[PDB]
Amino acid sequence: MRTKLYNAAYFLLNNNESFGHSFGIRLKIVGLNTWIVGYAVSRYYFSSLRVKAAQDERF
Amino acid sequence: LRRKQQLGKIYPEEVSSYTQINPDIANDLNLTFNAKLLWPVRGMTVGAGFFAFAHLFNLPYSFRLGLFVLPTAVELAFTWGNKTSQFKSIEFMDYLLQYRVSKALLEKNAKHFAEKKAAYQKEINSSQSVQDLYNQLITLVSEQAPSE
Numbered sequence: 018m019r020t021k022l023y024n025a026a027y028f029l030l031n032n033n034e035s036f037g038h039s040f041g042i043r044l045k046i047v048g049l050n051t052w053i054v055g056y057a058v059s060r061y062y063f064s065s066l067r068v069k070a071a072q073d074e075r076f
Numbered sequence: 077l078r079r080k081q082q083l084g085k086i087y088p089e090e091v092s093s094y095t096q097i098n099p100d101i102a103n104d105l106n107l108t109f110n111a112k113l114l115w116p117v118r119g120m121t122v123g124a125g126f127f128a129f130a131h132l133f134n135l136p137y138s139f140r141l142g143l144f145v146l147p148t149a150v151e152l153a154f155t156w157g158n159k160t161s162q163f164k165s166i167e168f169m170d171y172l173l174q175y176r177v178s179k180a181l182l183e184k185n186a187k188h189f190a191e192k193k194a195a196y197q198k199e200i201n202s203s204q205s206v207q208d209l210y211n212q213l214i215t216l217v218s219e220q221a222p223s224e
């Protein structure tokens with residue numbers, strides 16, 4: 018059975034002011050939360066790093 | 077940093093020497109210092125096993141790439157950080173500094189003790205340290221010697 022397909026609406030709709038206005042707020046909140054979580058993860062990651070070793074050192 | 081600065085550099089012979097009291101000294105000293113790059117080989121092996129499983133059961137490639145990343149992520153998470161390894165590294169570095177100081181003292185006075193050493197090796201057939209033998213002798217005197 019050949020599965021049916023469709024043309025995604027957002028690929029063929031003229032850009033509108035409503036999309037912009039609403040997705041702007043959604044992206045603002047997404048950016049805020051992502052920035053907070055990424056800052057936490059960045060602090061964790063950098064603090065996880067090892068200490069600098071000597072030159073040509075084994076173990 | 078302070079202790080490592082005092083030590084300067086660490087050679088594998090000393091690490092293997094301290095292996096007596098901490099068998100995982102290399103596994104701990106790798107996770108404290110930026111000596112070599114660590115690859116999550118166990119995580120990648122588990123990922124390859126999951127890849128073989130998926131290949132057998134015909135899963136989409138996205139699933140197997142995700143199941144390769146996931147064990148790798150777990151291995152990395154369980155590897156990095158681990159500040160206990162830093163405490164063990166501090167202990168090892170203290171041991172190593174004491175050992176190096178004593179070794180330097182040995183080298184500095186080696187010529188002075190050559191004659192006494194030559195006389196001593198011919199009279200005592202034991203390789204045990206002088207301090208231990210003298211403590212044992214002191215205990216032997218304190219126990220058996222008549223106070224008089």
Ligand SMILES: CCCCCCCCCCCCCCCCCC(=O)OC[C@H](COP(=O)([O-])OCC(O)COP(=O)([O-])OC[C@@H](COC(=O)CCCCCCCCCCCCCCCCC)OC(=O)CCCCCCCCCCCCCCCCC)OC(=O)CCCCCCCCCCCCCCCCC
Binds near residue numbers: 052053055059063064
């Ligand atoms: C598409 C390809 C893209 C490729 C990109 C490749 C990027 C490579 C990056 C390499 C690593 C860079 C690290 C920089 C660290 C900076 C901090 C620092 O120096 O810390 C010193 C650091 C110690 O860190 P720490 O002090 O403990 O804490 C650092 C924290 O960041 C805390 O420090 P802080 O308290 O000072 O923090 C400052 C404060 C500052 O925060 C603020 O106040 C924010 C201000 C923002 C202002 C922005 C203004 C922009 C203007 C826009 C205008 C638009 C106008 C439009 C108009 C339109 C018309 C109207 O917070 C931040 O900085 C926020 C960070 C959190 C980020 C949140 C988002 C994370 C997820 C998204 C990531 C990006 C995705 C992009 C996807 C793109 C897709 C297309 O130690 C060092 O000396 C390290 C130096 C850095 C090198 C590290 C090397 C590690 C190597 C690992 C091996 C693997 C490498 C792989 C490389 C791959 C290359 C391809």
Ligand SMILES: COC1=C(OC)C(=O)C(C/C=C(\C)CC/C=C(\C)CC/C=C(\C)CC/C=C(\C)CC/C=C(\C)CC/C=C(\C)CC/C=C(\C)CCC=C(C)C)=C(C)C1=O
Binds near residue numbers: 027035037039043
């Ligand atoms: C709110 O409800 C809604 C929805 O939810 C139900 C929707 O689904 C939708 C539709 C949803 C969709 C079409 C979703 C599918 C499409 C998507 C996700 C496409 C959008 C993708 C993204 C936003 C992610 C990619 C973008 C990024 C990672 C942003 C990266 C930004 C960067 C790097 C910043 C670039 C700019 C700079 C570096 C600034 C350069 C200039 C300077 C620094 C100035 C110089 C400065 C000095 C000091 C000299 C709508 C409209 C809606 O309203």
Ligand SMILES: CCCCCCCCCCCCCCCCCC(=O)OC[C@H](COP(=O)(O)OCCN)OC(=O)CCCCCCCCCCCCCCCCC
Binds near residue numbers: 115
């Ligand atoms: C938005 C949605 C998604 C959000 C995701 C959020 C994720 C949160 C994760 C939380 C946990 C964070 C854990 C951080 C561990 C970081 C480890 C790391 O790579 O550190 C860098 C390390 C070298 O660091 P260091 O030894 O300290 O040296 C510098 C010292 N000054 O580097 C090294 O030692 C290099 C070797 C280790 C790293 C190997 C990585 C292998 C990756 C394999 C990928 C396979 C898949 C490929 C797919 C594409 C194929 C075409």
